[PDB]
Amino acid sequence: EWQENKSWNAHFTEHKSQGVVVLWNENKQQGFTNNLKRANQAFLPASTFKIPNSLIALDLGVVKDEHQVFKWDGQTRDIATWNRDHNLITAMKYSVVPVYQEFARQIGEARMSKMLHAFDYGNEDISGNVDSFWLDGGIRISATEQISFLRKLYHNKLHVSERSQRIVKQAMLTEANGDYIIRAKTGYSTRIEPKIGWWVGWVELDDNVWFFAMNMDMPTSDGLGLRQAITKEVLKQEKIIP
Numbered sequence: 001e002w003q004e005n006k007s008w009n010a011h012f013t014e015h016k017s018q019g020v021v022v023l024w025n026e027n028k029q030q031g032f033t034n035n036l037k038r039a040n041q042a043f044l045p046a047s048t049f050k051i052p053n054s055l056i057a058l059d060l061g062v063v064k065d066e067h068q069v070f071k072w073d074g075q076t077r078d079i080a081t082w083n084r085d086h087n088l089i090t091a092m093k094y095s096v097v098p099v100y101q102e103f104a105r106q107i108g109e110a111r112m113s114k115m116l117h118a119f120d121y122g123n124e125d126i127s128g129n130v131d132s133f134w135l136d137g138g139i140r141i142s143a144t145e146q147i148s149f150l151r152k153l154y155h156n157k158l159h160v161s162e163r164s165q166r167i168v169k170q171a172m173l174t175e176a177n178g179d180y181i182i183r184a185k186t187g188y189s190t191r192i193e194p195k196i197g198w199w200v201g202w203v204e205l206d207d208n209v210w211f212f213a214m215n216m217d218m219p220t221s222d223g224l225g226l227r228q229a230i231t232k233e234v235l236k237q238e239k240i241i242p
């Protein structure tokens with residue numbers, strides 16, 4: 001069941017923004033969104049694609065473990081944090097595209113396509129460059145499809161090893177305190193209109209899990225912090241976090 005709560009739109013209007021937040025109450029098997037239509041609109045995943053990409057690279061042995069160092073190729077890029085060595089944890093933390101492009105090249109088109117089909121991921125279309133299709137290719141996924149994929153990951157039900165799923169969930173760790181744990185991944189799609197920002201993941205509580213997927217229009221990088229801030233405003237309104 002899906003329920004529409006337009007009162008969350010105030011959190012977007014407050015910041016002259018437009019977007020969608022989708023929540024799923026795992027215990028109750030109930031979903032909530034401010035915009036049912038946009039919740040099912042499929043967009044490029046951009047760096048949220050680092051979740052499946054990590055899973056595939058680990059299961060195929062392209063990445064050995066979360067400590068393997070992927071050395072910087074020496075090309076100075078516009079993101080300072082990318083011009084350094086990384087492991088899986090830091091590469092997800094800083095959304096280090098060039099590390100994941102190398103992964104994708106080693107995975108290859110055929111294994112990439114097969115895995116995404118096995119994951120039931122979005123429209124399963126990797127058309128484009130094997131090392132950029134999640135940024136400017138044919139793959140599309142909606143906020144509700146992100147949640148359905150993440151639920152499989154949470155439960156170790158994806159068709160990769162349990163170990164691979166455990167490592168990626170570790171790498172998704174974003175915030176933890178005495179009240180909740182957030183495992184999540186941001187995205188920023190700039191190469192093809194509409195430019196949007198993503199945040200997808202879940203909130204672990206003592207006795208429930210709330211999955212979330214949000215996206216919002218992002219004409220400039222100035223608003224990127226609104227991805228987390230708006231989501232948290234919704235979570236606070238629903239009393240999921242303090």
Ligand SMILES: Cn1cccc1-c1cccc(C(=O)O)c1
Pocket residue numbers: 079094095186187188221224
């Ligand atoms: C600052 N920036 C401009 C374009 C892309 C980025 C960027 C780099 C690293 C992480 C993130 C993020 O969304 O978390 C964004």
Ligand SMILES: [Cl-]
Pocket residue numbers: 169170173
């Ligand atoms: Cl952890």
